[PDB]
Design a binder for these strands. Sequence first.
DNA 1: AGCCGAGC
DNA 2: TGCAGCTCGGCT
DNA 3: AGCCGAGC
DNA 4: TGCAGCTCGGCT
Lengths: 664, 664
Amino acid sequence: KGIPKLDDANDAGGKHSLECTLILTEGDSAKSLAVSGLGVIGRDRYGVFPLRGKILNVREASHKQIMENAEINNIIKIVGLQYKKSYDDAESLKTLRYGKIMIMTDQDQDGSHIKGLLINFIHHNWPSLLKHGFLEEFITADMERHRILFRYAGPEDDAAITLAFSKKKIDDRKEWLTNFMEDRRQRRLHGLKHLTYNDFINKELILFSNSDNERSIPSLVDGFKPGQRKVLFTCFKRNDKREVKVAQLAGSVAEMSAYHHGEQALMMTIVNLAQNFVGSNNINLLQPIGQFGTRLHGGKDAASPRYIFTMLSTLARLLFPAVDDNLLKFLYDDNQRVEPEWYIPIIPMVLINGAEGIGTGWACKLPNYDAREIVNNVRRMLDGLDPHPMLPNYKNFKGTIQELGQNQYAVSGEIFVVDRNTVEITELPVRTWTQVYKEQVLEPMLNGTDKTPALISDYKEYHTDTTVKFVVKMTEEKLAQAEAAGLHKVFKLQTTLTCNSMVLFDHMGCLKKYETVQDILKEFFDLRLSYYGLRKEWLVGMLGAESTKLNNQARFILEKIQGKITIENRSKKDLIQMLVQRGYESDPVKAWKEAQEGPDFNYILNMSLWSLTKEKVEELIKQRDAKGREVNDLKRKSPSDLWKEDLAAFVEELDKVESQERED
Amino acid sequence: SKIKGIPKLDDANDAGGKHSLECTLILTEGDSAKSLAVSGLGVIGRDRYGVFPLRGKILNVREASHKQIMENAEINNIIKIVGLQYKKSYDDAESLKTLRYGKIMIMTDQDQDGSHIKGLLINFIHHNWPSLLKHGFLEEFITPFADMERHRILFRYAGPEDDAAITLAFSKKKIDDRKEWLTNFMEDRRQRRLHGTKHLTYNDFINKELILFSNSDNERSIPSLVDGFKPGQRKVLFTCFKRNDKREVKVAQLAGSVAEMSAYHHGEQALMMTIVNLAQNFVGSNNINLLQPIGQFGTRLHGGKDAASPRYIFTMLSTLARLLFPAVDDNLLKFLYDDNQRVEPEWYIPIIPMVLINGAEGIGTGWACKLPNYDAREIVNNVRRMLDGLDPHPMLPNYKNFKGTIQELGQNQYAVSGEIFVVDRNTVEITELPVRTWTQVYKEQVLEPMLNGPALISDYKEYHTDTTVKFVVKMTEEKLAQAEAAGLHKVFKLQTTLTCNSMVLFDHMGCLKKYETVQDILKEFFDLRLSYYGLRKEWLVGMLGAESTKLNNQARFILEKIQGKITIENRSKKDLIQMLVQRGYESDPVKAWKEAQGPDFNYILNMSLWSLTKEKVEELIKQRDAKGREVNDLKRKSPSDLWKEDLAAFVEELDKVESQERED
DNA sequence: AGCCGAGC
DNA sequence: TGCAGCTCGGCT
DNA sequence: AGCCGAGC
DNA sequence: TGCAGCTCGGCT
Ligand SMILES: O=C1c2ccccc2C(=O)c2c(NCCNCCO)ccc(NCCNCCO)c21
Ligand SMILES: O=C1c2ccccc2C(=O)c2c(NCCNCCO)ccc(NCCNCCO)c21
Ligand SMILES: [Mg+2]
Ligand SMILES: [Mg+2]
Ligand SMILES: [Mg+2]
Ligand SMILES: [Mg+2]
Ligand SMILES: [Mg+2]
Ligand SMILES: [Mg+2]
């Protein structure tokens, strides 16, 4: 007692304790449905207590963490659990205020994950309790066919719980999930009350684990996770010419693209897409209009999403050309068409902004690469040559990145000895934030700590919001020692960067590990090249259909102004039959679109009466002719040519955009 | 002396030292402004300048309970940071020895709500330490920084007229004087409208700055007589109409939509709450909810306080909305502008006085407004009666689905009773609570005390539903007879009084007025709405007239084309435009009519070629005649006839909608 | 130990 | 995801 | 000793 | 308006 949000059971703590159920709900809303579902009657045997958000994995959480956790302590107090005390006999169980815990989560994967973390919590502290049948679940009277009993049934349950939640079973989880993904491919080519913990883990929780990967680990093809892809898709559909509140953009994405989660995560994703400070995006697809955070705090200083604004970068449709949309496979969420399975950008975006995310079994980490360097390599491969090797590269980073080994790099800031008493620091290594360096490095150097001596006499700061300048004073003696020991080393201006986890989803939807970024580059290249061929086939078909369509329209207009044909007072039916008999083609553009998965002459008869006038007749001829020349000008271009055009246009604008950024 | 457990404070380096009285504490409006002051001070400023942010409006300490004052976080925080002590005169220069800061600089938004926070801060210091105002303790920083001194206004205390100004603004004893104060302001501004420093005194801040807030408080809090809306509410409707959603929208998303579309200059949470309020339909809320509660919008159980978050509930227009606010009337409204953007009208003009239906209520400065709900059908019937020149029946308050009783004690005085019935000589039954008594509150504040304590009842059970109230109460046969001896409704507090002597509203001209009876409100509404039916008729005769002319010309052209009487084939634009003039075709009749508060033939020449076909020629002729009849039919009707048509349509959909509610 | 970020 | 309190006037 | 609601 | 912590993996 004395715990808020708890609706303790009436008979709890008394002689009916072991016949009392604590209902633990995912969220306050689920709690209040449990409350109205009990009525007056249920309050004797049933208590209810909400949890907000994911809970601690206690199995390898530190002791400070476990002792300080609100939720876990609240559950312990409410139920009467005691650490170390096993529940073997029946005199033990007389110490509990409740006899059962009934977990009521959303019937979604994240719901399953909470069920799992709760199960994990009991199993790790009181495994004996699991055997007595302590845990139940409420799936969403009928109210008894909704209840399911978790059954312990031997040591294959201890193995399954540990497979999901032990820091020592990461490799096991990879195998586990590899088997799962392999099975579900096989099932895709063909077709399609007690619950053991093993069956829960291996038939329900694994769906969360998989979904966690699908949402946290990006695609090779466009560098996007599904949430980020929804943000772009929504922005492309909107086509905003002026900025939008981020919070408002989030609701739009939720609605236009069937995003089924809390909008806060969306707003945060949008902020992460727009950020443009040293160590975030080499090319932000979204414009950071307002305070989106700075290198002073790693963006942690962004303003609230209801006071910041964004819109597409002019580089966005240059990187993801609208016409290629006709080539994408757009997904469906209950009969609404949403974002595509991936976009197909002109260079590999996954390398530019350096994908990163954490799933189950695997994680992704990729550093940034230089956009012009990637353009040049793509041009090289278009020439049949081999791509040059690429080092990680961060836009506006003044330091150095040197190869140390396979997928390992030294990232160094800049420190120059000015006089015998003064060093100057003008760059921090990538992802070292200014405030953090000040507090964790320079302060301890000025003040000493309990464990370290002072090393400097003073420091002064001269940063701008995008640059770094520390002026540090020392004694001639201490500077001399610092040099001998290595300035970057002493000043923590040198960090390593290790990339042995380049895990991405390939274009088929398969999770692969890539050993080098040249492998990533080459797989991207082969795919993008074939999509340029698909674009050509599509444009020839479409432009050809438009040519035909203009020819028929222009022929009618001429046949009309010469008295060769009349529609005046002719009936619909006779007009159609006259047109057929004179070899006018049914809507060619519609016919073409149709052949991509009664005769229609509306493209002709929907023309305005203006069409018959002198200038409009001339203008219609010039357009008919111009389309013909446009069909042919396209046929003369190779997929390589089309690509090289896109790349040239992109670089022109990239130069202009980066130039305006250095002035502003 | 330092300061410890005040996390958001940036203390001046020299604060609390010998150089205390040269230190300045900057109080900001919100954390946002706190960070801009922190940057503005840089590293230099951190010595003499302190920064502490206040979130929200602060306590009015003049006439506040002793408890409120002691428990309030901001006031107590300011006191610790500055080192003030209650009941100490800061008259000499020795008394100032105990302050950690010598002055406070207030930094707020330069809007009316900022002025209010300034005033409340001034009120705080003034009421506790007048002494300090003489020494010039308070200053302010005007804002849209290294040019600080031009931005820095000092407050001057010049005499007991400064005391009177502050007291007039913030004393519970000077409500009447505030009425007079604002009446002058509204009058002077009505006159000016027809026709055409460094050391601010308190009197001038109050009478030239704060009064601007007090007035804005009224403009946003007191409803209009015409449509019963406040500006926030009006903007929400205007947006809904403009949007015309055919399916539900998330409340949070609609709020963002309103802000964008109607230039709503405030936080969106307030707007989300307003939206929820507009949509509620439980007993005691709206009689006709103009927005639909799709999701959990609160219940009579908690007075709606149990509504879900605005991001998990949906809304759209009631089918009754455009029946009450007919679209055609939009053409008669004066729409407002917010700097090159057309926004909501100054009012909508509904077909019955909505201000009576859902019972307007708000609190301003000097004035407040309360109005109870009235029955929709009774109002329709009084409108009909007045249309027939009869007398309007007097009206009693009516709450949709209220099962109890509302009795008139006298003008604007009513007694509202719930329902209590004797079941047996041991048992009573409560089946209705008085209007605006919420179920959980009644249980907690009435029944519980009666069960516990000198205890009057022996037990009680609950059989509520979401929308109905049922308590069964068990009593001792002696106690019941006693309870029944006094009033049963009295003992069980099932009778409340409702008193309506503050029916203050903005009239159609924008003047604030106190109405004595609803009959007065009804008359004034009535004279204005009848007059707008006149306008709608004139407007419709004119526009339909233009449309008729437009169709006449179009039909004419078509008939002349299909007969050879006119040809456009291969004619230049000029020759064709000049020809049409010569034949007396009229430049776009509708365009011309609209402009009326070279020739344009596009309305003829933009017609499709289909127009010349048999079926289309007949359809055009039918349409032309249809419009002919429509103009004529309308010309014969009175404004009063039009009004009866709208009312009849409104009542038919009300019967349908309300029927469907009493089944779902 | 704590970052990275898309979920609750 | 939910948590946190004030203004202003009339009324009880 | 607090509701009502549009603001911060 | 801003406040509150946890997962999952790789690597510092
Ligand atoms: O529980 C949540 C939560 C739930 C659903 C959506 C969002 C949140 C949430 O943001 C949150 C907290 N936010 C603080 C800043 N981090 C930004 C990321 O959104 C803080 C605490 C918190 N829950 C507390 C209990 N969890 C502790 C583990 O047992 C939430
Ligand atoms: O300061 C605010 C605040 C500021 C701007 C917008 C909203 C709020 C706000 O909601 C708020 C609180 N919300 C509780 C729910 N009530 C309904 C209104 O949304 C609670 C406290 C609070 N500020 C605390 C300081 N005021 C203390 C007076 O001395 C705010
Ligand atoms: Mg869920
Ligand atoms: Mg990135
Ligand atoms: Mg403001
Ligand atoms: Mg109301
Ligand atoms: Mg009061
Ligand atoms: Mg970890």
